[PDB]
Design an enzyme around this catalytic site. Structure first.
Site, PDB file in Angstrom:
ATOM      1  N   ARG A 107     -11.150  -0.865   1.873  1.00  0.00           N
ATOM      2  CA  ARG A 107     -12.596  -1.060   2.121  1.00  0.00           C
ATOM      3  C   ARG A 107     -13.125  -1.154   0.730  1.00  0.00           C
ATOM      4  O   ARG A 107     -14.179  -1.900   0.608  1.00  0.00           O
ATOM      5  CB  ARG A 107     -13.141   0.496   2.898  1.00  0.00           C
ATOM      6  N   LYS A 160       1.529   7.932   0.848  1.00  0.00           N
ATOM      7  CA  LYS A 160       2.061   7.909   2.103  1.00  0.00           C
ATOM      8  C   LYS A 160       3.038   8.578   2.350  1.00  0.00           C
ATOM      9  O   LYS A 160       4.221   8.456   1.648  1.00  0.00           O
ATOM     10  CB  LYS A 160       1.789   6.413   2.740  1.00  0.00           C
ATOM     11  N   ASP A 211       0.743  -1.100  -0.074  1.00  0.00           N
ATOM     12  CA  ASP A 211      -0.037  -0.097  -0.033  1.00  0.00           C
ATOM     13  C   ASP A 211       0.918   1.326  -0.162  1.00  0.00           C
ATOM     14  O   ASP A 211       1.367   1.650   1.118  1.00  0.00           O
ATOM     15  CB  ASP A 211      -0.871  -0.099   1.129  1.00  0.00           C
TER      16      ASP A 211
HETATM   17 ZN   LIG Z   1      -4.450   2.417   2.256  1.00  0.00          ZN
HETATM   18 ZN   LIG Z   2      -4.550  -0.494   2.659  1.00  0.00          ZN
END
Ligand SMILES: [Zn+2]
Ligand SMILES: [Zn+2]
Ligand SMILES: CC(C)C[C@H](N)C(=O)O
Ligand SMILES: [Cl-]
Ligand SMILES: [Cl-]
Ligand code: NA
Ligand code: NA
Ligand code: NA
Ligand code: NA
Length: 499
Positions: free
Chosen positions: A349, A275, A268
């Protein structure tokens, strides 16, 4: 694979590298928990001044010509009237670390006298075995020259009958083969544990077990099912996504079916909503939900529980790049629910949503339990040693809480706050993928709940964003990938579904 053995006679035990002697703490003083040969007592008398028998406390000393074993570990279990399964599990996990650091390969463990305590031999032995197996694990290492700590190779528990002990040991050993698989998959390089690798692991499990069938969807098949939320997350990836369905039909005459869903984001980056570097460093862990489902299925097939379970793993990297799915765009799941992207870093999600829809369309679930390293808000809420979970069914929640208590894999139910469902409001879609308030774990759970579309299925969601991977080693788990949840869920299914 076979590690633990029962031995009834103290006098007929074989030599071992180490002997683990159990102690209670009585008035802040160490008190022998089993009958100890007085010649052995004299050997460790020196060590008693700085050893009080507190739970998990250890003292290491060497034997002599008057003792069989040449290394001796004194192990504290705490106050005898306060002894618990988690105390025993964590104490023997701690002893295992001490033994391995002392480079022991064979161990004799003297079983305490607990006849006077309401604590059962079965519960003690189960937790002893689980603690040893948990910390007899090595995370993968890549050193030019192998540096890994040696394994314990034989652990003999002295003072129990083979009949009672060995059944417990072999059961825990087969269960921990699944735990180890989960840990290995989470720990290993993200460039190795791709979505294709996760599919290969699932195909290998199905190959090994006649009871297991597998279906693998590639990107083209994901799009043919119209799983546009998974397809969107996978859009920018340099490795192909996979959608993996494992089916275990252990009770063909029953309609009762459990669907387990695991988030498999194999790395991720956050996507376009990139990030920060320090937040990205551990993100090979973001497929731990998927690894948990695979580890459960390994244990499930080995233990041959007479239940029906389906495992569903959506798997993809969440990449940043020119084809990455867009902040602010709307993507559509396989039943037509639309999702406006408030953050591409809320990607887990999305892929879980299409997996939930798939389960309801094809798998006739009685219950759905999902596992996901889903939200940073969950680590703020409950830290690294307790996982929050959400459930729309109070029986399911009570059962999972009881399984949590009995395995020592700590869960804490959190509320599906109805007032926060509006925090997902979108003007142009059925929902946004991030909430407008600060309770990020709750709105992430409410997001998943949308995809039940008022189907009355029982559902639980475990947010293991804190418990799946430990940068700091903490009992009763190794450093890094914990395998949290595998033992808890196997116990849940055995105790509440299989009888
Ligand atoms: Zn994420
Ligand atoms: Zn994730
Ligand atoms: C206020 C924070 C959420 C800022 C963050 N860098 C963002 O713009 O997404
Ligand atoms: Cl930002
Ligand atoms: Cl239920
Ligand atoms: Na093994
Ligand atoms: Na099979
Ligand atoms: Na951001
Ligand atoms: Na963590």
């Amino acid at each position: 694979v076979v590690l633990l053995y029962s031995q009834a006679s103290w006098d007929q035990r074989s030599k071992a590298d180490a002997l683990v002697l159990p102690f209670w703490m009585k008035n802040s003083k160490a008190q022998e928990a089993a009958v100890v040969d007085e010649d052995y007592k004299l050997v460790y008398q020196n060590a008693l001044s700085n050893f009080s028998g507190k739970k998990g406390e250890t003292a290491f000393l060497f034997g002599n010509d008057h003792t069989k074993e040449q290394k001796i570990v004194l192990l504290g279990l705490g106050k005898s009237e306060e002894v618990s399964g988690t105390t025993v599990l964590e104490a023997y996990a701690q002893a295992t670390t001490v033994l391995r650091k002392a480079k022991c390969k064979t161990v004799n463990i003297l079983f305490p006298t607990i006849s006077q305590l309401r604590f059962s031999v079965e519960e003690f032995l189960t937790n002893l075995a689980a603690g040893v197996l948990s910390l007899n694990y090595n995370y993968p290492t890549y050193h030019k020259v192998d540096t890994s700590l040696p394994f314990l190779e034989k652990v003999t528990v002295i003072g129990i009958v083979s009949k009672v002990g060995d059944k417990i040991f072999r059961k825990e050993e087969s269960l921990f083969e699944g735990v180890y698989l989960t840990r290995d998959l989470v720990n290993t390089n993200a460039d190795e544990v791709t979505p294709e690798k996760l599919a290969a692991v699932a195909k290998g499990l199905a190959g090994e077990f006649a009871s297991l069938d597998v279906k693998i969807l590639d990107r083209k098949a994901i799009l043919k099912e119209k799983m546009g939320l998974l397809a969107a997350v996978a859009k920018g990836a340099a490795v192909e996504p996979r959608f993996i369905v494992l089916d275990y039909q252990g009770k063909p005459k029953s309609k009762d079916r459990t669907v387990l869903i695991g988030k498999g984001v194999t790395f991720d980056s956050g996507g376009l909503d990139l990030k920060p570097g320090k937040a990205m460093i551990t993100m090979k862990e973001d497929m731990a939900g998927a690894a948990t489902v695979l580890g459960i299925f390994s244990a499930l097939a080995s233990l041959e529980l007479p239940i029906n379970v389906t495992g569903i793993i959506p798997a993809t990297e969440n990449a940043i790049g020119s084809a990455a799915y867009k902040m602010g765009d709307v993507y559509v799941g396989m039943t037509g629910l639309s999702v406006e992207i408030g953050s591409t870093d809320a990607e887990g999600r999305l892929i879980l949503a299409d997996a939930i829809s798939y389960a309801l369309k094809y798998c006739n679930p009685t219950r759905i339990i999902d596992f996901a390293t889903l939200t940073g808000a969950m680590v703020v809420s409950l830290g690294e040693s307790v996982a929050g979970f959400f459930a729309n069914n109070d029986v399911l929640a009570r059962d999972l809480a009881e399984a949590s208590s009995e395995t020592g894999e700590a869960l804490w139910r959190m509320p599906l706050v109805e007032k926060y469902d509006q925090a997902l409001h979108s003007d142009i879609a059925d929902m946004k993928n991030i909430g407008s308030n600060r309770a990020g774990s709750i709105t992430a759970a409410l997001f998943l709940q949308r995809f039940l579309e008022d189907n009355p299925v029982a559902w639980a969601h475990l947010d293991i964003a804190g418990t799946a991977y430990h940068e700091k080693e903490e009992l009763p788990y190794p450093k890094y990938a914990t395998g949290f949840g595998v033992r808890c869920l196997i116990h849940y299914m055995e105790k509440f579904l299989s009888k």
